[PDB]
């Protein structure tokens, strides 16, 4: 589920509460969060707690400004997961 929502999320002139990763060493296995932030490296000449060349911070920001176009609006997204096990299903609707 995804729906357009800037009337709630785009503080005028820009929202800065929303960050996402851009640089990570590995592609992300399915269904894991990776909260921790550190510094990235670029080829050789690596970094350690320092910033600049070959160095980056992983968390960018969204400038959610209402003046933006449709292509850059915020979207509130919620996803659901269902599965069939031997276990009693416990969440449905009929059950009589």
């Amino acid at each position: 589920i995804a729906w357009n929502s800037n009337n709630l999320d785009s503080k005028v002139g820009g929202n800065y509460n929303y960050l996402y990763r851009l640089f990570r060493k590995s592609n992300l296995k399915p269904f894991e969060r990776d909260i921790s932030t550190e510094i990235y490296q670029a080829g050789s000449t690596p970094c350690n707690g320092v910033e600049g060349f070959n160095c980056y911070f992983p968390l960018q920001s969204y400038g959610f400004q209402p003046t933006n176009g449709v292509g850059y609006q915020p979207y509130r997204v919620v996803v659901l997961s269902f599965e069939l096990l031997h276990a009693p299903a416990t969440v449905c609707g009929p059950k009589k």
Partner: antibody, heavy 122, light 108 residues
Framework: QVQLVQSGAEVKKPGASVKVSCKAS????????MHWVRQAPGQRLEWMGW????????KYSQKFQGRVTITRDTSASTAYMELSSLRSEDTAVYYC???????????????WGQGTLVTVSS | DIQMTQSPSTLSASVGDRVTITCRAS??????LAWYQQKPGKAPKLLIY???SLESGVPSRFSGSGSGTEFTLTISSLQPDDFATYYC?????????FGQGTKVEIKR
């Protein structure tokens, strides 16, 4: 409990430049939220700006466009600010705050420093 | 910019009573507000954020309400610990302003 402490009282002169500074006491540094505000003596609080204690982001106010700057020191994990081209109206009390801590960023003031006194006189 | 005026400017009360506070916005707000307490010669307290939520560490008297434009603050009983001003803050949009200020005194 997270605590914020800063420098003392501090008397400057029109045209000069001034630097106030506060050390943080954070259980986590999860893109901490240094976020300054001002208070002219007993009148409206008017808002200073926010530095990104996470990496480097420096979002400032319009009325103080072009003359105020902020940074932070990481291993000291303190945050500093200039405040430049001072003037008589500029006399006030100066507040560190922020410290979202749980979440990554907010826009509310939940951990205040207990205040800095700046007097611009001739 | 986001306009903010609050009423009434000053109010009256006595210990063990309810006092209403109304924060007035000129222009539409989506439950974007915080309520702060201000003792003289002090650094501010927060106790409502988000126009409803009660943040931890506070007496349970405090309760926000309202949405849209009219915003309201509520306390059931009046401790001496309540004798200070109270400020409302918007965070719908940019540069974030404050209110005017709303103090209680001691009426007799």
């Amino acid at each position: 409990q997270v605590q914020l402490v800063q420098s003392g009282a501090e008397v400057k002169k029109p045209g000069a430049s001034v630097k106030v500074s506060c050390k943080a006491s954070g259980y986590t540094f999860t893109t901490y939220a240094m976020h300054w505000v001002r208070q002219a003596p007993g009148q409206r609080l008017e808002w200073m700006g926010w530095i990104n204690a996470g990496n480097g982001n420096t979002k400032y106010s319009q009325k103080f466009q072009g003359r105020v700057t902020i940074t932070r020191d990481t291993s000291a994990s303190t945050a500093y600010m200039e405040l430049s081209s001072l003037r008589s109206e500029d006399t006030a009390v100066y507040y560190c705050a922020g410290g979202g801590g749980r979440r990554l960023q907010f826009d509310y003031f939940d951990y205040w420093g207990q205040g800095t006194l700046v007097t611009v006189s001739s | 910019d986001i306009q903010m005026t609050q009423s009434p400017s000053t109010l009256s009360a006595s210990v063990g009573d309810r006092v209403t506070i109304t924060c007035r916005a000129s222009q539409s707000i989506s439950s974007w507000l915080a309520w702060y307490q201000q003792k003289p010669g002090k650094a501010p307290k927060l106790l409502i954020y988000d126009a409803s939520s009660l943040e931890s560490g506070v007496p349970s008297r405090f309760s926000g309400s309202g949405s849209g434009t009219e915003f309201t603050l509520t306390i059931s009983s009046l401790q001496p610990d309540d004798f200070a001003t109270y400020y409302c803050q918007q965070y719908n949009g940019y540069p974030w302003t404050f209110g005017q200020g709303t103090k209680v005194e001691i009426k007799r």
